[model samples]
Target: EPIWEIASPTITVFSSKASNDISYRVPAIAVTKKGSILVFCEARYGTWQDKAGRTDILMKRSTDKGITWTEKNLTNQATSSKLSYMDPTVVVDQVTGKIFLFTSLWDAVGKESAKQGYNNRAIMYTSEDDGLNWTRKDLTDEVEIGIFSGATRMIGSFGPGSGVQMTSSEQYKNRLIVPIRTFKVNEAAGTVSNGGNTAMWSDDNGGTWETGQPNKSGEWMVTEAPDGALIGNIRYNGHRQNYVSTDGGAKWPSFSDYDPIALPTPAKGCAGSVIVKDGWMYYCGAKGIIETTAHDDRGILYLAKAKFFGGHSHTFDPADHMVLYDKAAGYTCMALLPDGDMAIVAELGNEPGFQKLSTRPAEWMRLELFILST
Candidate 1:
């Protein structure tokens, strides 16, 4: 398999220690059809806490793979004093050459909460001039209602990484798959319930969406197989769950039990990402068997080649994997560069106390590139 790290962790993509930005979380990356690499993260201004009023969706672009980056920009700045944006995930329409960014918006006086809170709805922004400009649209009514009408109550969050664009399926060609976690809000009890993994897919280039049934997992990322099937890789119960959807994510059947790739993970939840290139699947996230802090020490990167057999079926064999960094790191996103290599953006460093803000500076968000074998 083609795999080699081309650069060290030299460039600091997002550093709270260097800028007014206090902390960074939920890293996502995508490469446009024109070869621009766009990296997105939640730029927390005042504190390290996940829910806040100062958090904004920020972005940085790199044209020369991961060698250099443009100055960070507050792409999705909040419109009102009460609104805060977080959990940015992006996808590019290869056929139409447009970029779609999906994120969650916190509603201050909405159904779930009265004041400052976390995700309550999902929204999308489209960019035609790469990451320079964007137009916003609320997808809450379409996607959230679809999920709530079914098993889950509402959409708590999105990928916090990048969504996948399917190209091989003739019936569902150019479909957009966005992974979501469900939420059940108890307004009277003043508590929010988090549910498992589900998805919303758009067939008409995100003009409309249809919610898929929730799989028995959480924090998922989707990728299209060579045979036009959709595979959802999920974070669940200390091991990764793999589910397949033959009918375009409408229904998912478990594939994890058959293959059972013993991918170790922390007890608390961590987000992983997947990118498919020339029938090969590349995945990266927090890897381990022992219980540790949820969002740190994410060192392992895995790669596998697809073996198609029994007509339209295929299987993944864990061919090659590597540990990029040995220290505290989590939430990885991958993108194929213009030079036929892969670029990854991840959160690095450790935070000890779960709730209280750390007295010491925490991890810096960084980017690295891999030279792929041709």
Candidate 2:
């Protein structure tokens, strides 16, 4: 039986630059306890550029699946901050019925200043009563303080999509995990380089957090397998990087480790999302086989499902992939709808003509899932 049926009825959540001088990008999405669909993205203002431009983390909630959505709402907590708020990742703690929204707050506006990250932060905003209200909490001191204690830090961002809460792990059952990517700084030597792609997690109903070891990578996202181990899919230069962690994501293999799973990717990497369900690992990302200058770097989006071969491995069978959309796409996210259908929020160039993908807005839709029976 096919793992996926087909995606249907795509709808736009945020129109490109729909007034307010805001054009949305970097889309992230999640579903709440009561089946509320929450889609979030960078509310880029005035300019579509991510750097030196202002952004607000705005979300729209849909109660009746993806049929309709509330107007975009910005939290009061971010209303006063002029700096860009980046990468909104959602994690839901089923134990206590709470939802957490994690994002990185840049120290300064420009890319250079933000990268010089002694003051950059990890912030958490939570909601206990669904998507109606929220309160913000800062996790920087707990998660990044030690990195700075060694006296060097840099800007980092959360999963460009949703995170997973462990369901079967005996040690960390119900534990929440969010993937992150950032740079490491060496001030004394005056050097800067790519840092590890680690993650931060919470176990107590999103009350507090701690970071995991780095698995040297670019933009990364997490998924927990049936064996209670985690398989983290990452964005990298060539094939997408996959890392497996058995100890609750506390430790991740460094580069040059025995990475057996080879996923597809463009020479110029792009952000991707993963979800493990029904003994299958489902992935969504760009399908560009080669990078051509500023063209086709992240042109096509594909959805594929592979049988999970336990820890740290899966299939990239050419036959398992299906193009989700061929138009300009980047940074797509996924979640399970209340009806058990797959929910996706993607950055797509919806028009008939050419436009930089950075200017692409958010679209939301549901896809049917298949559970083949013998």
Candidate 3:
């Protein structure tokens, strides 16, 4: 389809004066009913390494469909001597009209030990009455869950498959789907204990949550599958696309590796967003960010379109499925807004700046033509 680079390097998210601020790391943006935008970012404290980008979460709202933005603080900044927060994912409840923002907090670590810490063992968050004022809650204290370990010791260490991860979405069963993963002590132990793909839900507008079926593989991002059944796109383990299923709200099967689109490399895991539109699913992943210690330079973002009819068959797996975005920079997260808008959160490498892409749905759809072709 259309894969155009953002023309202006000037499209600024929030920046800070703090010498050690994250500047623009860990971005999560969502659109409201009135076209307003909510963005989550890490506010660094001491250094860009130790406790860097781990102080608090900052939010910004855009009034005019993303042309401009107005910001407000969602989490107060109080450098916790024992804890820090990062990787905030924000979403809104359609039934309650309440905003729900989720994040993981953990002990501070230097750049060297960044990959060897339990910074994200569980999820915590707050809700706003009018989408402004937020009161933090300690959810981890109650729901105790570990992260999903990988084949290698460093799989759940850093980069893509790091710490406890969560994916939230609305499904047909009149329940909210919150998929979580934990980092176990060892890879084998993690899989045996089924510490990979799990789910949590809320019926009373996020007041209380109930955990759902657990799977084997981690690094999962779930969306309403084509058949209305709950299917998860799991990463970090299988040689091909990994999947698991649930009948209504019951438990799911042990995750299995299925061949649809053979990833360039099976090491790093899928790090981009999965969008379901019309009847097809689109996914974007960082080419080499996690697979090897090679150049770590230009990272390719692949755009693949698959049909989920016969358990996620590969309708289109063309050779050049990638959108020609900068391969050197990092492609992290992506989401499709209600208004048919698509945005990608990434880290700009060679240019020496944070990378974020905000584009219309039509623009991103054109990238499919490349994948659909030979």
| CA lDDT, every model vs. true structure | 0.66, 0.68, 0.48
Clashes of each: 2, 0, 18
TM-scores of all candidate predictions against the true structure:
0.82, 0.85, 0.69
Q: Check candidate 1 and list the clashing pairs.
A: 297-328, 297-329
Give the better candidate number (2 or 3) by lDDT: 2
Model 2, stretches more than 4 Å misplaced?
A: 18-20, 75-82, 110-118, 144-155, 187-193, 254-262, 289-296, 350-354, 357-374
Candidate 1 structure quality by residue, lDDT tens digits, 105-159: 8764434342233346777888888777878888776765344443336677787
The model with the greatest TM-score is 2
Global CA lDDT computed for model 2? 0.68
Better of 1 and 2 by lDDT: 2
- Candidate 3 local Cα displacement, residue 12, angstroms: 4.5
In Å, residue 255's CA in model 3 sits off its true spot by 3.2
Ranked by TM-score, the better of candidates 1 and 3 is 1
Q: Write the per-residue lDDT of candidate 2 for residues 291-362, one digit (tens) a residue.
A: 443445565667778787745456767776777677666777888765657777766653321244444333
Distance from true location, Cα of 366 in model 3, Å = 24
Residue 272 lDDT in candidate 3: 47
By lDDT, the candidates rank as 2, 1, 3
Candidate 2 lDDT score at position 297: 58
